[PDB]
Amino acid sequence: HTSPDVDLGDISGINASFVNIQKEIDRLNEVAKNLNESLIDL
């Protein structure tokens, strides 16, 4: 008599990516600040 091992499906490969859009947020804030240099003063 014997007993077959039970190997559960390994799920460690499932990984969740991260997002890094901090350059774009910084550029958006920089442009929202620099647009004050484009105002017209006749």
Partner: protein, 71 residues
């Protein structure tokens, strides 16, 4: 002179707004990619978890049958 000032300021502002629109498009594309990848990850995890729980269910059912046979 004032017209040249207006045109120069307008061209500067349009260039800056073009930069901002390109930045927003890049950020939205990156967010879309990451959100879709994590959605695919959650779906793959749910599928593998369903498979693993099916296997666990089968194994415990066989084990309960063995215990029933013993006792």
């Amino acid at each position: 002179e004032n017209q040249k000032l207006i045109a120069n300021q307008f061209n500067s502002a349009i260039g800056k707004i073009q930069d901002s629109l390109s930045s927003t498009a890049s950020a939205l594309g990156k967010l879309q990619d990451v959100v879709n990848q994590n959605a695919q990850a959650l779906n793959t995890l749910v599928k593998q978890l369903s498979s693993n729980f099916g296997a666990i269910s089968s194994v415990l059912n066989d084990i309960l049958s063995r215990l029933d046979k013993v006792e």
